[PDB]
Design a protein around this ligand. Sequence first.
Ligand SMILES: NC(=O)C1=CN([C@@H]2O[C@H](COP(=O)(O)OP(=O)(O)OC[C@H]3O[C@@H](n4cnc5c(N)ncnc54)[C@H](OP(=O)(O)O)[C@@H]3O)[C@@H](O)[C@H]2O)C=CC1
Ligand SMILES: NC(=O)C1=CN([C@@H]2O[C@H](COP(=O)(O)OP(=O)(O)OC[C@H]3O[C@@H](n4cnc5c(N)ncnc54)[C@H](OP(=O)(O)O)[C@@H]3O)[C@@H](O)[C@H]2O)C=CC1
Ligand SMILES: NC(=O)C1=CN([C@@H]2O[C@H](COP(=O)(O)OP(=O)(O)OC[C@H]3O[C@@H](n4cnc5c(N)ncnc54)[C@H](OP(=O)(O)O)[C@@H]3O)[C@@H](O)[C@H]2O)C=CC1
Ligand SMILES: NC(=O)C1=CN([C@@H]2O[C@H](COP(=O)(O)OP(=O)(O)OC[C@H]3O[C@@H](n4cnc5c(N)ncnc54)[C@H](OP(=O)(O)O)[C@@H]3O)[C@@H](O)[C@H]2O)C=CC1
Lengths: 299, 312, 313, 309
Amino acid sequence: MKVTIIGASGRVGSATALLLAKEPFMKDLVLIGREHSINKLKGLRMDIYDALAGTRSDANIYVESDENLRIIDESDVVIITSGVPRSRMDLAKTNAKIVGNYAKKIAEICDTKIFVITNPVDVMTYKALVESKFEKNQVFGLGTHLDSLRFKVAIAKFFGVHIDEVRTRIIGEHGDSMVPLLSATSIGGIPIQRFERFKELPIDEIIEDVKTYGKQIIDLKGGSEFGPAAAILNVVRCIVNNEKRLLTLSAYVDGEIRDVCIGVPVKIGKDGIEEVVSIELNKDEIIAFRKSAEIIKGY
Amino acid sequence: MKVTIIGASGRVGSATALLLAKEPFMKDLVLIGREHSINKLKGLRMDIYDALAGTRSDANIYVESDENLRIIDESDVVIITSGVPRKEGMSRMDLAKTNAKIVGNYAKKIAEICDTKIFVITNPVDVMTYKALVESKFEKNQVFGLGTHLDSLRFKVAIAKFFGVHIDEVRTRIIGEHGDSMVPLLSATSIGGIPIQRFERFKELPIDEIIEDVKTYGKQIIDLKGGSEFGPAAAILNVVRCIVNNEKRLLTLSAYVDGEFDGIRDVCIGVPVKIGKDGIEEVVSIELNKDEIIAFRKSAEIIKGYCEEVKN
Amino acid sequence: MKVTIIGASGRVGSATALLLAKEPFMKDLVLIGREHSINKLKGLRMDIYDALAGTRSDANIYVESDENLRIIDESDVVIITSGVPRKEGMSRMDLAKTNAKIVGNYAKKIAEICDTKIFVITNPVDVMTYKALVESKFEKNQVFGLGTHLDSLRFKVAIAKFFGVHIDEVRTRIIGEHGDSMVPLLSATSIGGIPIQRFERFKELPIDEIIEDVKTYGKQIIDLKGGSEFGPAAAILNVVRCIVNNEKRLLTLSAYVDGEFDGIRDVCIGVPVKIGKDGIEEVVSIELNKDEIIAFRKSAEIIKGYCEEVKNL
Amino acid sequence: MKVTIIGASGRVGSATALLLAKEPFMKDLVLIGREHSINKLKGLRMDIYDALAGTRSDANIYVESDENLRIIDESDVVIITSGVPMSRMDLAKTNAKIVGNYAKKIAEICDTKIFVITNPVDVMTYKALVESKFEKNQVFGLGTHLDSLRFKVAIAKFFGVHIDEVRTRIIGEHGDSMVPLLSATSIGGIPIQRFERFKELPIDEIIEDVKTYGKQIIDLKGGSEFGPAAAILNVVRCIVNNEKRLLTLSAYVDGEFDGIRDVCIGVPVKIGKDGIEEVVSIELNKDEIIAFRKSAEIIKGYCEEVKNL
Ligand SMILES: NC(=O)C1=CN([C@@H]2O[C@H](COP(=O)(O)OP(=O)(O)OC[C@H]3O[C@@H](n4cnc5c(N)ncnc54)[C@H](OP(=O)(O)O)[C@@H]3O)[C@@H](O)[C@H]2O)C=CC1
Ligand SMILES: NC(=O)C1=CN([C@@H]2O[C@H](COP(=O)(O)OP(=O)(O)OC[C@H]3O[C@@H](n4cnc5c(N)ncnc54)[C@H](OP(=O)(O)O)[C@@H]3O)[C@@H](O)[C@H]2O)C=CC1
Ligand SMILES: NC(=O)C1=CN([C@@H]2O[C@H](COP(=O)(O)OP(=O)(O)OC[C@H]3O[C@@H](n4cnc5c(N)ncnc54)[C@H](OP(=O)(O)O)[C@@H]3O)[C@@H](O)[C@H]2O)C=CC1
Ligand SMILES: NC(=O)C1=CN([C@@H]2O[C@H](COP(=O)(O)OP(=O)(O)OC[C@H]3O[C@@H](n4cnc5c(N)ncnc54)[C@H](OP(=O)(O)O)[C@@H]3O)[C@@H](O)[C@H]2O)C=CC1
């Protein structure tokens, strides 16, 4: 496998680079960054080897500037971390330029898949898909995957059940228009509504903590790096091994809502997004989902 | 952890012993079998130590006949595999009684040494769990059997294959007897949290064929190689892992039920159960649709018959 | 990867099939057997999948008879377990020739299909490796045997247990015949890079009893449970993992020795080898002390006698 | 196990916190830092939990300031990362202050083993041993472990053999007074001198790069965070599981080697649940004894000048 991290100098980028360098399937990792980043990245690589300690002697790491993207050729996936820190529309445009440029350059080199993490992730995935000309199945963004994971952990801790028993999600925007799918939330297969303890669940407090998670972690340490990297590693594993798991990622929706990249349920595999799962949403859910889709169409 | 396998001389016992010795928490493994088996049980041990190749030097494996069960003291879990095989000329009741004597005697002897948790694999597993509980006098949380765990796993894998999704995305179960009275719970089956009944390929699910294959798996594998040993041992390994790490998972096991379902009482049957360090932490009660509860009560009656006949 | 176990219906064959099926580098596992075992193998397959419980969806397990060997094509390794047990009343030569027929015919057929590597488990492992390489027409780098790998592992674990160090710190070998003429190499035994001689406790080491047990293990385990199945399967798994990942470890295997040791030539015997994706990449040549080279000679002499009286059947 | 990382806000500290928190033998991890870093460390903890994604529910990470060390009680190991980025003496003394005070407070609160990551690691291990008053089997430092590992990987890459086949060690100071031990280097139990290709080995360039790695990575990214954290994790796993491996660490040496005396220096050691269970005594060749005694002299100088601050 050959993955290219564009923005490997970042926090999420370097965390994910180290995590991927350890997988047995990673054979050619490509760390890309602007020219002033090159030296820095050459250091990252150094340390990434110091950790492997000779275990992966068939592993190869490459460092190149964002000028000579010819090394991207034949990459299975290209993960884009490049972006700028925080008005909302101002940031949308500022980062849209970067991601559109990178997508355009990537498509010129090869027909690959694109994993967008930069924010606003849904609109950034829209811009990437447009400026790449790629098919709707080969471009996707992190979207509300991390928020859904946090929500799942919260529910599981409340109910005192193992993490694997809880299956839920949060579709919508990676923002405040989130739409928790309580209709598609189950414990061991049971709908959560058939538990009596569901009436005691602090729903608003949980969802508010999830909405504010980025704010809190920015206030404390200046941004999340480890957890996002772990989630991205898991998504890459879902792709390379053709695992066909039902994730929640920002994808192009058309009738499943239309002409918008929003956080929806998706079956991920070797061929990227193989399916956008369309399911019946209760009334409030579908209303709020439409609202989130409007806000996301804005940018 | 200190696990004891009574009947480790057998197929399932040997497989389970090998798989448990490989675990990082298995610090003392106790292999019990009748006296004529002692030498064989030593062989097993030797081979296991050959497989580890020194990777676990803190591991002790013991071999003792079923006469001197004092080596069981302080065991976390005692897995009972010892049992007689079904044969032509045996009614279901013949097997129930013949194996009830065995499991009941072993459970009474176990209770005489220590206060531990008993994991019944011997068949008819639901009835044998009932008998182990009766003769051991342990609490309703310390005795349980495999039951429909494996059948539920097979059903889950089948559904996942049909929908072409990862196995971890499918959550389903089969309650009732480890037998033809099985009751798959299609009401509490989901793919990614979505009920399967919302998917449009559900009307295309060959559910009848899947259920037939699950019910007949035992006969098929006995026809081919005389019995199942690898898969049952893997499932038992994961149940023991659920216990030792207090993972609090929602498994499907043969547990004692008293009212948690409508009209199920004084019976060991395959039900949903939250399993952790203290055994059966909870028997999950759930509203079954009309058909599910009708069939569940029928299976409960089938089990109650043999249970009544084996108590004394 | 795609491995083929020829004799999967046996103890070692089935244990190895189970262990290999769990590996994530196993896309195609091919279980071969005589026709009368096709259903037994099917049973095996079923049970294996049962134990996998749907974790491996891209994995495929095939079952076949030993007449349609076309399924063996593109296989990275072919393990040979097919072989007859020594029955009381069998001389060493008798077992040699009987199992020679089997391994040789399987090797010739393997060659007829495609070019692959051949991992001989069948005992007398050294002679069987010789016969397989004969009838395969393959290069010497693509045919090897388990040989004295297990015995070396047992010796190492014993030393480690006595010195109270982790297993990974001990680095020893036992070369030569997988038999009574074993050759423990105390000249090349170290504990933390430090030759075991330098350790004062090497005086107290019960060397003789340890080697006694290493040599008697076979009949000890045959007398109790009838034979070995777990340890050999684990060792075979390690060798296969070394091949697939080109780990380039220095193992101790039955390899063809052409003058790499003084006096040893045209014989398959237990030697140090550097194993990789291309098979035996190097037969490592090292300076034995006096007694060790003498014993290695004699062991090679015995193996050569057997390899000669059987080389044409 | 219950470990406590003093300096968890550092680079190495955070990397090690994340690696340890993933281990299943980690029931209680305690992240200690100065008061001004409290919020920061809290953030770290948050991130760590985010990376665990609910897998470790028996995991308990506690964050606290370096004033309320009461939480350190019952910790199996305490890893000290706190340090300052000057001459050599200047850094030695400045960090001796920090590590000595932390060792003394650790001793006040409870009894434990102290793993010194702070550099100059040999001198700092001496000062931890002093200000803690603990037994010598209880105070060690990373020392020349990483250097030995990089030397081993280089030999492995050259000879085209798996790393696990190479078994080498570098003893002495974590610095230019290093002493690569070619007398105790083997490749599969074969003395590497018996290999002919040893004569074509670029030995000196290898050793120079080993000496320069720290500065080289500091010239690019700021400092080492991942590799040191991995080696630390391996040493802690050897400690907790009583693995009985023969590592190369900074330990107190009292004549176990002919000439060495009252010096915390890098030597071969048998590590277990008891910390340094033994200093392995080896027969070195003339040149290696000479260089090792010189390294002892250097470290003794620094230790003498930082003995009472
Ligand atoms: N749930 C989610 O969807 C999550 C979203 N994210 C988002 O992903 C992005 C990455 O975050 P993080 O890695 O912490 O960010 P950092 O600020 O730490 O890294 C920024 C990266 O972008 C590059 N970069 C910055 N400005 C430009 C520019 N003008 N042109 C090109 N490249 C540029 C930097 O390169 P250089 O070294 O040259 O400055 C560096 O690679 C953020 O937008 C973040 O919000 C991440 C976490 C979670
Ligand atoms: N899904 C499920 O619930 C499964 C249930 N099972 C059941 O578990 C049991 C074990 O099966 P399996 O291991 O294949 O069977 P085996 O016959 O291979 O082994 C059972 C062991 O029981 C012991 N035993 C036999 N007779 C007696 C006796 N009279 N008194 C005491 N001990 C006796 C023997 O060991 P020793 O001589 O040392 O006492 C024997 O090795 C069976 O009843 C089987 O049906 C197994 C497979 C799956
Ligand atoms: N340390 C070592 O190197 C070890 C070596 N071995 C050796 O490996 C071999 C396998 O042992 P084990 O698995 O216990 O023995 P088994 O007899 O249980 O298995 C060997 C298989 O060979 C096949 N076979 C037997 N005769 C013939 C024949 N005439 N033609 C074709 N196939 C035949 C059979 O499968 P089927 O009927 O389907 O063909 C049989 O199951 C033995 O020779 C054993 O000595 C094993 C243990 C350790
Ligand atoms: N091979 C080896 O032996 C290696 C050793 N090291 C050594 O480990 C140490 C840590 O390096 P690194 O993590 O990059 O350093 P950082 O500066 O990134 O972190 C060290 C931490 O020390 C604390 N600190 C700083 N000054 C003081 C002070 N005056 N009093 C108390 N605490 C203080 C700070 O945390 P807070 O504010 O919370 O106290 C700071 O985060 C260095 O000395 C380095 O040389 C590093 C890697 C390799």
